[PDB]
Amino acid sequence: DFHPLNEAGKILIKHPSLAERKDEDGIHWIKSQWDGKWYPEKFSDYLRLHKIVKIPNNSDKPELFQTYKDKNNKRSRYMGLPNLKRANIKTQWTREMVEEWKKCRDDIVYFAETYCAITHIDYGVIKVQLRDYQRDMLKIMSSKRMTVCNLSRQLGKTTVVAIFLAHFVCFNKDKAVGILAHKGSMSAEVLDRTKQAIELLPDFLQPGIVEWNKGSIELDNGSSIGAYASSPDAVRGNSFAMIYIEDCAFIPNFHDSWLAIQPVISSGRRSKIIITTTPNGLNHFYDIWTAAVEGKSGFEPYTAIWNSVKERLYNDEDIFDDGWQWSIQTINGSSLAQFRQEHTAAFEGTSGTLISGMKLAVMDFIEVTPDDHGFHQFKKPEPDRKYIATLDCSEGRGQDYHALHIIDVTDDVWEQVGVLHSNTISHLILPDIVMRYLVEYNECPVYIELNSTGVSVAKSLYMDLEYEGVICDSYTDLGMKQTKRTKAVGCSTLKDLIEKDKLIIHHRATIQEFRTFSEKGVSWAAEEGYHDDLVMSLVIFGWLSTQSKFIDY
Numbered sequence: 001d002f003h004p005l006n007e008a009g010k011i012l013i014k015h016p017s018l019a020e021r022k023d024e025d026g027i028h029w030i031k032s033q034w035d036g037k038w039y040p041e042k043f044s045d046y047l048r049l050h051k052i053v054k055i056p057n058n059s060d061k062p063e064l065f066q067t068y069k070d071k072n073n074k075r076s077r078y079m080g081l082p083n084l085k086r087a088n089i090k091t092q093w094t095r096e097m098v099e100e101w102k103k104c105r106d107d108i109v110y111f112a113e114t115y116c117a118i119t120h121i122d123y124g125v126i127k128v129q130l131r132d133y134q135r136d137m138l139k140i141m142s143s144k145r146m147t148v149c150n151l152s153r154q155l156g157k158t159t160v161v162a163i164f165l166a167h168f169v170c171f172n173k174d175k176a177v178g179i180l181a182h183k184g185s186m187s188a189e190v191l192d193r194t195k196q197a198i199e200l201l202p203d204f205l206q207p208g209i210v211e212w213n214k215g216s217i218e219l220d221n222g223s224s225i226g227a228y229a230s231s232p233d234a235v236r237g238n239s240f241a242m243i244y245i246e247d248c249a250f251i252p253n254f255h256d257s258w259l260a261i262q263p264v265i266s267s268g269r270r271s272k273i274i275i276t277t278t279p280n281g282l283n284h285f286y287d288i289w290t291a292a293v294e295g296k297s298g299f300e301p302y303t304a305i306w307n308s309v310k311e312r313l314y315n316d317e318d319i320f321d322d323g324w325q326w327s328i329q330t331i332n333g334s335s336l337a338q339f340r341q342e343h344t345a346a347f348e349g350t351s352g353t354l355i356s357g358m359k360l361a362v363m364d365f366i367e368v369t370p371d372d373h374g375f376h377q378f379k380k381p382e383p384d385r386k387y388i389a390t391l392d393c394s395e396g397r398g399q400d401y402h403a404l405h406i407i408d409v410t411d412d413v414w415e416q417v418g419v420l421h422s423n424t425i426s427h428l429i430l431p432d433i434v435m436r437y438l439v440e441y442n443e444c445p446v447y448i449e450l451n452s453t454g455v456s457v458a459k460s461l462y463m464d465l466e467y468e469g470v471i472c473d474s475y476t477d478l479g480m481k482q483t484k485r486t487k488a489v490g491c492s493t494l495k496d497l498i499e500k501d502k503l504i505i506h507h508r509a510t511i512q513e514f515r516t517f518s519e520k521g522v523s524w525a526a527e528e529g530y531h532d533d534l535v536m537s538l539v540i541f542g543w544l545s546t547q548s549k550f551i552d553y
């Protein structure tokens with residue numbers, strides 16, 4: 001029957017068959033369902049697209065600063081170690097060098113792809129081959145002050161975490177870094193890798209080394225990296241410019257250590273903080289991730305799981321299968337319970353759904369016969385009652401649906417009184433159709449999602465049909481402008497509204513879409529083969545609900 005992962009009726013992985021194809025540059029490509037990128041059919045073709053680059057051995061030519069290391073001059077070497085340079089050596093800055101240094105300074109991906117190395121036994125010093133997830137993480141950790149990663153296990157995260165920590169200390173002066181982990185030996189392992197990165201850097205990017213031991217390093221610029229077992233002592237006692245928290249979810253009695261962290265980041269001496277971990281049930285981390293993902297804590301959420309290692313997407317026969325058999329083989333020889341625990345970064349005591357099943361079980365519906373159009377009337381319009389309409393237009397039409405909700409806003413408890421749901425109505429005749437329902441419900445104001453179709457619909461209502469009740473956040477944008485944050489907090493507010501019983505949903509298909517509107521880290525969406533149009537239209541309302549003008553349309 002099912003692919004192990006697809007245990008219930010729900011599809012968590014699509015077969016290679018259903019994947020989009022493409023023939024280009026003499027090779028057969030297959031689109032991956034995890035990132036929507038094109039991957040060659042043959043594994044051998046993937047390798048000649050991600051081939052190894054040797055960083056050549058340079059003690060000879062100081063002119064070639066990109067690779068130059070003064071390894072043979074022992075006086076220049078820190079403690080006679082070839083890879084490390086003595087503290088306080090004056091570098092001879094040429095104009096080229098300054099530009100390249102500065103380039104690395106504010107382009108972390110370039111620095112990571114050009115200068116970070118691993119020393120291979122067969123090919124010598126080679127460039128680290130970054131992965132798309134790692135690249136994404138570098139950008140985020142760099143551009144944002146506070147970042148939190150919900151990763152799976154056996155992703156080589158440390159490789160990227162090391163590169164970043166290296167980049168920080170090598171291109172910032174007088175900056176103290178503290179790595180915090182459950183055990184101090186864990187955080188010692190992290191900086192070991194950071195040191196493995198630092199020691200392979202060319203002279204011009206390598207600051208001189210003052211201290212260089214297991215639990216601590218210090219550079220001649222003033223920057224340091226300290227390995228610590230997580231404690232409230234470590235945070236208060238030190239003045240950190242950056243705090244990296246390793247395996248955060250698996251740190252017992254973290255609440256006090258976390259409270260010690262607050263003043264260090266939150267208004268605030270204002271320092272960077274990077275958290276990376278696999279999840280561990282509904283503990284303190286679930287609260288961190290949720291606050292980040294709902295856009296409440298200023299943290300930038302990021303997530304990556306097994307499929308980010310693209311080697312797994314090619315089977316034993318070296319043909320692209322989008323991780324179909326690797327996943328089967330990894331499920332076997334172990335357990336589904338363990339695969340979720342090891343490879344999926346899912347939280348234990350919960351499903352993905354935005355709305356808790358605890359709430360989705362209590363939710364009753366009102367069965368009604370819809371119009372010629374897609375309109376479901378739950379409660380008739382009443383004179384002197386305030387209504388609010390939200391519209392998520394298709395694009396689209398199956399693909400997906402047009403979704404209009406009408407919400408009775410009069411009382412303290414808001415009620416969904418009408419829903420238009422259609423994949424048959426053209427967006428050219430929709431404005432009129434929608435209007436008669438808006439006009440039926442006491443000249444109901446409407447907040448339209450400004451997608452390609454929405455913008456158009458907004459025009460027709462406000463201008464062509466001269467409807468004076470269309471809500472706009474600006475004069476260029478006649479509806480809800482789509483942003484990452486609007487969706488995030490719209491979902492967050494929708495969750496609250498629904499669960500605290502401020503918003504009452506009557507439409508069965510709406511409640512049913514909530515049933516499969518779940519985690520699509522770092523956001524929420526509909527899972528395979530489901531629609532989210534009805535939910536997404538209510539997200540619009542959620543976001544509108546937070547707006548001051550709404551506090552009484």
Ligand code: NA
Pocket residue numbers: 470471472473549
């Ligand atoms: Na308005």
